[PDB]
Amino acid sequence: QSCLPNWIMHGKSCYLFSFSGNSWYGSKRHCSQLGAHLLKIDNSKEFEFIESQTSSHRINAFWIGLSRNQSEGPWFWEDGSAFFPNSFQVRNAVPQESLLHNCVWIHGSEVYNQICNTSSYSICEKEL
Template sequence: MEYHSNTDNLDEEGYTRLDFHSRGISQKPIISEKGVTSSSCPPRWILYEKSCYLFRLSLDSWDMSKEKCSLEHSSLLKIDDLRELDFITSQTSLQPYHSFWIGLSRPQAERGWLWEDGSAFSNVFQVPNTVTNKNVFPICAWVHQALIYDQLCNVSSYSICEKELEN
């Protein structure tokens, strides 16, 4: 319905005409409190570019989070570029008191960081070394607000699952 305050909206008798035609409305995703959801993603998942993201708000270890993502036919988040990192940090900043596991871990001291799929970490961001006991492995990564930190993998935290859109 469209209303114009000028005389273009008046009929011959001076009554206001209502226009019930939709203009410029397309099939757009619904915006939720946590971001953009779409029929392309399952319920509660957020669409960003070519992936769907689930911000799980149950506390689990890194391994259990990985397993729960797998049950959702997804994996823990793999951050591929700075745009995706910006999206993730904008979402996690909505939960400023919580940290979220991502799919990055360091299984042994002599090995570097690896993504859950086995690929090497490409240094899109830095992971500060904050775990005080340098002899404890594996170490996992989580995002808290706008930063990624290392953490003991058995600590309970929220997590982020990711799956690519199906074509």
């Protein structure tokens, strides 16, 4: 099958590495504007491809589709599907106390929680 201009084909989907700063919120709207969603990392195969591109773009971090309503709350993907530490675990980045670290980005080969209104790059996914 085919992907759109500037989107990368891999596996069961097309991905767009958006080198443009936005909140997680804005990054979520952008992907959806394009008929897509924030990157769901389903399994280690898909993590491996993602990590090959995120680790060659170290200067940037990339919001993904993982979040939680609040600090005590479970992580969930965009489709509402539950999170499994089948590919990565979320590294708690919080310096001290915080109720705001409720959105997830990837940097290099690691995944961190960050403040949702923080500026970062992003990855969009669209299933073939």
